[PDB]
């Protein structure tokens, strides 16, 4: 989708970067794109983070467009959970997040750009059963997102479904069961056509 | 008056025999305090003491307070054993109810000498009573004995609004003038009933 | 997004002493107000703590 | 508050896995004084459900 829309330079800051088969991803790269970087970044780690900044303070061309993709959080319900196990994931699963938001900012790189999108999944809206930290995570991100953007930061929570190209064929059975509750699937370009245009607009 | 069961001139004579009776009762060397203690924590302690005999609940306002009246002697150490236990009183105020059998007698016969003069007549709506807790009947409404038991028995408020609700008011409007009535009416009616029915106190 | 319950947003009644209503607080002192409220109109409370 | 968002998320976990139980939550302003405890459970008893 950045390369259908004209960007230019751009990082897939990752840990997946150095160890997916991403031969394609750089082969669509080559329309409208000009400069690609892979990383191996863990965005779990302070001083990796500091790496991105150190990264993005390099001669490349301003940074003006950020997008945190989603992330599978492990299963659970109020059953076979406890105080210890929330505490250990749930950490788990915002210790990233957080701590980009937070060190972007800190080095004054936040504010001076048009989007900075968070995932979020629109099942976290009403809940869904078996689901306790995943649907604690995107509450939380939800909350830190706000206070950026009350501060006048364009950071966005997006609440999105089940991206198309994300129903694996290997295992269809989350796809079947998100069918069947009415959560259907759509495809990611579209879904940033019509979030991306907004966060300066409205 | 309200109920249609008296005329204004037999309303207009009655008040002032019950007037002069009430000089008597509040001149008189006893006191009253209010406990917040109810009426089964207080008619156990009133009962199982004979070294403190001379003295009585008065009023059954609303379910957390009591009043207490009679023997000023009495009524100060029933107050002081409460503070020292656990529990708020009020300081002493002036007595409620008749404080020897020498006063009944008289009110008796000045009260038959005037309610014989009254020209009462069968109630347009119910007319409830803090005497009985219950919808007075014609032939007690013309007795003196009903009259006069406001000097001698526990003021029933508490009763009369539960059966206010159980035969179906929903709205319930104070004539506020002294004794702030609504208050207490609220808070005896509001934990009664069934769950969620509505109830307006103006 | 939130809705004023402007229309019929009167408290009613609450159903009677039938069963107590614990109250868990962060403070004591507040687990003892709402008890000490909820006591004046005769449904029966406990205060607890961490 | 940001720490706040484990009770959204505990609240609509039960919603969905303890469906015979009613539950409510009541978001308070975190700076002005709380209200009665009858204004409380007066507005929830109005919920059946959740």
């Given at each position: 989708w950045l390369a259908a829309r004209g960007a230019r330079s751009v990082v897939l800051?990752?840990?997946?970067s150095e160890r997916g088969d991403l031969a394609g991803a750089r082969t669509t790269g080559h329309?409208?794109?000009?400069r690609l970087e892979h990383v191996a970044v863990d965005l779990s780690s302070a001083a990796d983070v500091a790496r991105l900044a150190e990264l993005c303070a390099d001669g490349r061309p301003p940074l003006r467009g950020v997008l945190l993709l989603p992330q599978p959080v492990a299963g659970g319900g109020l059953?076979?959970?406890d105080g210890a196990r929330f505490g250990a994931e749930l950490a788990g699963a915002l210790r990233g997040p957080v701590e980009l938001t937070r060190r972007f900012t800190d080095v004054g790189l936040t504010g001076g750009t048009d989007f900075f999108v968070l995932s979020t999944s629109?099942?976290?809206?009403?809940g869904r059963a078996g689901t306790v930290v995943g649907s604690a995570a995107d509450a939380f991100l939800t909350a830190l997102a706000r206070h950026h953007r009350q501060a006048g930061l364009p950071v966005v929570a997006a609440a999105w479904g089940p991206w198309l190209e994300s129903v694996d064929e290997s295992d269809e059975a989350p796809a079947v069961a998100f069918a069947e509750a009415g959560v259907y699937p759509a495809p990611g370009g579209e879904m940033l056509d019509a979030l991306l245009p907004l966060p300066a607009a409205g | 008056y309200a109920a249609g069961a008296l005329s204004l001139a037999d309303g207009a004579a009655l008040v002032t025999a019950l007037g002069r009776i009430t000089e008597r009762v509040a001149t008189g060397p006893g006191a009253s305090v209010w406990v917040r203690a109810t009426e089964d924590e207080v008619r156990a302690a009133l009962s199982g003491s004979q070294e403190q005999v001379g003295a009585a609940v008065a009023a059954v306002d609303e379910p957390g307070t009591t009043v207490v009246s009679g023997d000023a002697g009495a009524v100060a150490r029933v107050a002081a054993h409460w503070r020292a236990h656990g529990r708020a009183t009020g300081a002493p105020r002036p007595a409620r109810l008749l404080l020897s059998p020498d006063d009944e007698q008289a009110a008796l016969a000045e009260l038959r000498a005037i309610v014989a003069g009254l020209a009462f007549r069968e109630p347009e709506v119910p007319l409830l009573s803090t005497v009985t807790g219950q919808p007075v009947e014609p032939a007690e409404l013309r007795s003196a004995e009903h009259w006069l038991d406001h000097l001698r028995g526990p003021t029933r408020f508490l009763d009369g609004v539960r059966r206010l609700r159980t035969d179906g008011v929903t709205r319930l409007v104070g004539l506020?003038?002294?004794?702030?009535?609504t208050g207490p009416a609220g808070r005896s009616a509001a934990?009664?009933?069934?769950?969620?029915r509505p109830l307006l106190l103006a | 997004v939130w809705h004023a319950l402007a229309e019929d947003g009167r408290p009613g009644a609450i159903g009677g002493g039938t069963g107590s209503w614990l109250v868990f607080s962060d403070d004591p002192e507040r687990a003892a107000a709402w008890c000490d409220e909820l006591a004046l109109f005769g449904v029966p409370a406990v205060a607890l703590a961490g | 508050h940001p720490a706040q968002a484990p009770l959204t998320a505990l609240f609509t976990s039960l919603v969905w896995e303890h469906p015979e139980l009613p539950c409510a939550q009541v978001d308070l302003d975190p700076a002005e004084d709380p209200p009665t405890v009858v204004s409380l459970l007066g507005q929830v008893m109005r919920l059946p459900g959740a």
């Open positions: 800051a990752g840990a997946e329309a409208g794109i000009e059953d076979e959970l629109v099942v976290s809206l009403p | 506020d003038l002294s004794g702030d009535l934990g009664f009933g069934e769950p969620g | - | -």
